[PDB]
């Protein structure tokens, strides 16, 4: 527990738990100011527990085989499409933010729904059991921050039915928050940590859409928009890392051919970026154009009554 | 009333009512700047009542069966065509924007007129009584923003007569605003909230046409056009959501085969999108090509002296 | 006068009159940029007089019986054919653009000439005296923009003689502008407002032909053609509305059986559309295939030495 | 001269003369792009001289008696047949295109030859001396674009002899260009303006045949054919108007009873259209079936060693 | 040679010669597409050499005495009948297509044979030596496209013997191609240009019969027949013009009294048309019913063991 | 050893080694306060050993050929791109900080990985053996401070394989420290000196990214940000100098076209600065826009499965 930390006694631990610092990584990655803002915690005590948490979490230089072990803590979520899983190097990655931008109706929201369904199929989580334990991915839950009102429980049921999963179980293990503007959107994202503290193993976070709120609220003001968006994406990236979570976001496009909106801050902050377009009928094509370790490539798949397939 | 909100006393409530914030949802979805622009309301007070309104409206994370309850607040309006109602998954949806684009004379304006008539037939509103009360849909009124001058009261009378409804009652419960340009069009849409505040249960909003004004006003300038159009569609989407209203818009087409005009912003902002074309004689075919939860499909119907039928 | 408007004093009124804004409707339907382009008029002043003009002209939401009153301001011009007047729902409508397309020699130009003659017969203007005053239709004048050189004063004289009207009076009350290309055609149409300002009660505007200039000037470039054509038709529609004028246009046809030329922009912009074809001898058949409120139908008539008859 | 025009100085005038714009009407009817394609002429300067030329040529709205004056600038050429001149309302009209279609051997080419002969008989040009001056029709010359090789100087001599005219004078005042295909045909027509610039008072232009080249070159491709034909007929119509010239064209026929070939574009572009058929022996019958101001009618005449007679 | 042409160097000349363009007139009358279809020749280069060839061949406007010089390049072939030569205005004309239609056994094929024999008698070619040189008509050769199998060398020998000519010389200077269907017939005609390129001075081309193949191959399909026939006759007319050749064709007749078969396209394309019928015994009567410059007239002649005589 | 220094005996040397001052240069460049902060070391003793270390290290005025010898101690690391090595004047320079800024996905992180691989290929270190000994660059190790989580051992393996190097050897000789915020980032950089003291020949230091942590932590506070950033870059520059190390940093960009973020302090502190942008496909372009001795220039290269190439 928190009292394992230097300078931290039962009293200080109570103050930390109340201020939301319940595990070591959050303390190890905190700033002294951040902790001193907690009544009762001094600069000296704050600096001492941060150093102790870094030490207990072994956050130092690593080399050799240890570098491979860190990469092995990443687990991946299947998309239900073999070509898409392949272009992704296996599946959607935990500890990163993956963005699907695309023209209207291309399937961005369908992919988000399919992901909430797939999270409830144990065989769709791919991981190295020696680096990620069965308990770490047990009873996974998803958080869907819907900023457009397009969450559709009947779609969840249909995709689950076709996947052989129970639809009600997916709805029971998915938290949906409807955000009507960028302030709500950002706050819900900041509150995911509270869901985790309440015992929910959040392993998938969806922000659909990442930018439609900001784009119609900040139309001159393009700096304050970029600033707020940057804070939001830092929160997303940090939660993906600290909670070994897959974070997926959708994005719209504008002319100039098309470019995902959101400018440089969204461009730098999204770890993986895709452009999704429609093919003939129910065919879709997802083009990976940014990733840390894979070549750009395209995946053809379909969206049908069953969800994503092929 | 508004004084149920934290920090809000009779004085502040008067200022809110005067500034147009009369119900909790509008306050819960406001920005601090938006409220502080009201003389007498501070940043602190503004932030406090927004949080209180969100709390009173229970705008947090939901899961399980509660996800189904939200979807059940959606009611649908019949189109008078059984095939069209079926392709729509039941009828035109409240809380969303539905767009009918199509070549000249295909029936876009006829569908808008039929919808104003159908709103006055209680049996044509389909809803789950446990989620939507009889009082919520009682004395419904329509708003028709006519940007081309094609509203025709004699057509309203004819369609009503054939539906067994009283024509004068439809005209009495339909507000029509003739907009000669995009500025008027946008302002009328922004003023619908005032009609509601005056006691009119606005449940159907029609924008016919959504784009003919913008397309001939902005011919280079294609960015300022897209910006204004985006603000207008955000206003439409928000009013559909906050007032549990069906919002219908018509759109024109251009070569490239045909594509509805308005580009990406109209494409992303319209929840449902149809392409209407003429068949032989009075036959028409409506092709649904964008929707959140339904497969693309086509509906055949007819437009006759009776209105839409089949 | 213009000083009735908020913010407008004698000085500003002079600037408005000089820039061509002489009546309230034109100001009520102007854009702030449009007015600020007048040296001396600020954005603030511009926005204030537009709002004041809208208010003085009562351009807001209307419902009930008021919806019927707006429709009653429409007056109709007889075509001299009882079957054609019937298919038209009474006659050619003011505040709309009516297009007659047809194969060569079918009578498009004859109908335009007959209309200029009929305008000078008081009994051929059909209107509701409680909505349209005798003074509003008094001393009516026609404008004929001839883009092919087919205006024929001797035909005017012959048709007038057979109608019992004085031929010279028709020529005296008809302004003809010969346009040799689309630029001239468009400019003449834009200058009709100046004729009105000079005291001419323009109540009929004829564009014969609407498209023959554009079709041979833009032969690739089919986008710039559609753009120019759209601006021209917006000017026509707006003048029909603001000046309670009947606007008639003729159009040619091409193979594919036949289709009027001009594509989607002419198709959407023409309120009423007819296809005229020749029958045996002097018999003609006009097929109405687009209108806001009438079923498609055909009218048989004849073109003789007397003009249009039957 | 050209420097009378606003913005045009000696330098610009030289550039205009070199680019072929030598008189005001051609400039008044030019497009800004058309003039800016002249090295040295800017968009601003181009727009300014076009407006100035329109102003100097008084190309605005006209009404009353002025409408009669425009029609009086039309002069007519006798056909040598009293019945044909009568069906034509006086003779072949300047400022228009007149088409004679007919079965083989019906006399199309004979009429073209007779017209070149008649142009050289002063009494065969009918005009209102107060609208058309003796100098305007003095030293008239004809241009005969022969696309079949049927021009026959011996026929010219024979018809001239029988008319009391000198045959050599007709040949001296007739330019013949043999076109072997539609490209040559169109280019010769475009070059008539150069003949005029060289001091030739071209008052009659004959295209015999208008369509035999296009019909065997474009046999699928029926759109490109119609496009080229349309450009050619626009050139013909514009030269008839700008140079107060009679333009005559011949056309072939096909089964379906017979119809002149060339489709809708030739049908709309020819101002007057005749069908010529053979009667018994040297008798011929010309049926007028399209004209702006005359009833359809038939003229009987004969073709003999003397040319057209009766 | 071809390098005299602008843009044409030795390389391009080789490509032209290989593609069959060996003399200037063929290039002057080519289309840009036609030349660009030659690998190595660009649109720009093609347009430039066509203009250069037209210029080198002086294909512009001509007037006065020059019009007589063009007509003087026409030479005529005697028919052996003085009355027939007289009705023809001298003899069969080069640069034109002359058709002899007639009932069975009337002598159509005999006239074709006599013409091949007469071509080998220098005194039977009538020409103006100042316009046509002795070298132009030297070593003339004939091409006989026999579509019925009726070419008879023994008839050639007999007619030659009676004319005082050597029979073998006529056979040596006559190329006969037996066509079993319209495709072969048309191709042989298209290949005459190759014979000329090989050094044969082709001055007479006979198509016997022009229509018997088409009439039994296309029996509904009367449009495709007319199209193919038109292409074939354009090829014939162009070769008559470019190679200053006499082209003769025979045609059959049907009831309706009789009419030559082939419809309007053969009727327009044949420059001269005759109807041949039998008189008593070996007497024949040829009625000229279409020609550019001669009155209709009849010639009586006989067909005997000597060939055509009288 | 340290006792070679004036005033320093075994006891004082122990205190120095414990406080991290193990070699003369660090002492020669220390402040008296810095050393007196070591219990047991007086101001007098501190001043005396600093002067002695400066003397033993010969840190005085130099001129003539000695100026060239100092510059010769700089060694350079190949980038694997010949154009990039050329724009760099040979390769990445030791004793300096080189910054690669660029839009998302441009290859900043790929260049950092390639550099860690290239360090393990002896032939990729370019140096003057008379100024830099084989032992000075022997067993080189890299330190990669990853502030975004984008270090990818599989990429190291792939690039090493394609370079002919052993992948495991690169991972064994590369220390990676994951920093979640600017405090960790700065501390890891300060701790590199300890790695060196432990016997690791650190010759490459990578900070990827230099600014993404600071930019989202300090959003007003732009002074404290600039101060912390300045201290961090001084630490980087000093370690590059004292340990003859190549220091590479990556940077993000913002609109204003683009500018690397970090303001004036990063701009002054980075010795070399590049802007990297994407070309077509895998092509990249690196623009050098700041350096001490080279002209601005651009290098084109590619990023493929092999790493950086061209
Ligand atoms: N139940 C279903 N059966 C078959 N196809 C479906 C179903 N539901 C949705 N679709 C398909 O999914 C498309 C809509 O996909 P969606 O993921 O919502 O697009 P989107 O990219 O998020 N568009 P938006 O947010 O406006 O930009 C539809 O138009 C249908 O083609
Ligand atoms: N009273 C009626 N009786 C029968 N059919 C009618 C009636 N009124 C309208 N229609 C039909 O409706 C068509 C016009 O439909 P409309 O809805 O106005 O087309 P639209 O798509 O809105 N065209 P537009 O806005 O120009 O693009 C007519 O041309 C008639 O076919
Ligand atoms: N004075 C007249 N007396 C009787 N009929 C007339 C008279 N004038 C014109 N017509 C008829 O009107 C026809 C021409 O009608 P018109 O209106 O000019 O056709 P149009 O459709 O405009 N053709 P165009 O513009 O080429 O496509 C003639 O060919 C005559 O049949
Ligand atoms: N010198 C003449 N004397 C008497 N009649 C003549 C003379 N020249 C020509 N004709 C008549 O004119 C007819 C030919 O007329 P022509 O004008 O060439 O017909 P066309 O319609 O142009 N035929 P085409 O172009 O094939 O379709 C002849 O067949 C003679 O009937
Ligand atoms: N050697 C000959 N001596 C005398 N008369 C001959 C001789 N050869 C042919 N004829 C005459 O020529 C007639 C046949 O002429 P011919 O030119 O073949 O007719 P055609 O019009 O071409 N018939 P066809 O092609 O069936 O329609 C015979 O029937 C004989 O009258
Ligand atoms: N294994 C690989 N094979 C081929 N190309 C690759 C591979 N790995 C990465 N890439 C390319 O490298 C790009 C990513 O380069 P990267 O160096 O991470 O960009 P970056 O500038 O650091 N972006 P960021 O930090 O967000 O601003 C990819 O999107 C691929 O184009
Ligand atoms: Mg209108
Ligand atoms: Mg010829």
From Swiss-Prot, chains A, B, C, D, E, F:
Record keywords, A-Z: ATP-binding, DNA damage, DNA recombination, DNA-binding, Nucleotide-binding
Record's keyword annotation contains Repeat: no
InterPro entries: AAA+_ATPase, DNA_recomb/repair_Rad51_C, DNA_recomb/repair_RadA, DNA_recomb/repair_RecA-like, DNA_repair_Rad51/TF_NusA_a-hlx, Hlx-hairpin-Hlx_DNA-bd_motif, P-loop_NTPase, RecA_ATP-bd
Residues the entry annotates as binding ATP: 102-109
GO molecular function: ATP binding; ATP hydrolysis activity; ATP-dependent DNA damage sensor activity; damaged DNA binding; identical protein binding
One GO term of the biological process aspect: DNA recombination
UniProt keyword Flavoprotein present: no
Pfam families, sorted: HHH_5, Rad51
Family assignment from sequence similarity: Belongs to the eukaryotic RecA-like protein family.
HAMAP family: RadA_arch
Record-given protein name: DNA repair and recombination protein RadA
Species of provenance: Methanococcus voltae
Gene from which the chain derives: radA
């Amino acid at each position: 527990g928190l009292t394992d930390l230097p300078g931290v006694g039962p009293s200080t631990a109570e103050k930390l738990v109340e201020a939301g610092y319940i595990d070591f990584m959050k303390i190890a990655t905190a700033t002294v100011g951040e902790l001193t803002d907690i009544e009762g915690i001094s600069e000296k005590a704050a600096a001492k527990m941060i150093m102790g948490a870094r030490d207990l979490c072994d956050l130092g230089f690593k080399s050799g085989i240890d570098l491979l072990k860190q990469r092995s803590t990443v687990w991946k979520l299947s998309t239900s499409s073999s070509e898409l899983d392949s272009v992704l190097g296996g599946g959607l990655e935990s500890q990163s933010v993956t963005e699907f931008a695309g023209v209207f109706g291309s399937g961005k929201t369908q992919i988000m729904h399919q992901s909430c369904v797939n999270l409830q199929n144990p065989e769709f989580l791919f991981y190295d059991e020696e680096a990620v334990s069965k308990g770490e991915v047990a009873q996974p839950k998803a958080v869907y921050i819907d900023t457009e009102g397009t969450f559709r429980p009947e779609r969840i049921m249909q995709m689950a039915e076709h996947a052989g999963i129970d639809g009600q179980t997916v709805l029971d293990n998915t938290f949906v928050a409807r955000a009507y503007n960028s302030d709500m959107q950002m706050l819900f994202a900041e509150k995911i940590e509270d869901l985790i503290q309440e015992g929910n193993n959040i392993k998938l976070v969806v922000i659909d859409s990442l930018t439609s709120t900001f784009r119609n609220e900040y139309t001159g003001k393009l700096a304050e928009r970029q600033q707020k968006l940057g804070r939001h994406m830092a929160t997303l990236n940090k939660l993906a890392d600290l909670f070994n979570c897959v974070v997926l976001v959708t994005n719209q496009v504008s002319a100039k051919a098309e470019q995902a909106i959101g400018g440089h801050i969204v461009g730098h902050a999204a770890t993986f970026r895709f452009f999704v377009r429609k093919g003939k009928g129910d065919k879709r094509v997802a083009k990976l154009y940014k990733s840390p370790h894979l070549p750009d490539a395209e995946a053809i798949f379909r969206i049908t009554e069953k969800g994503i397939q092929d």
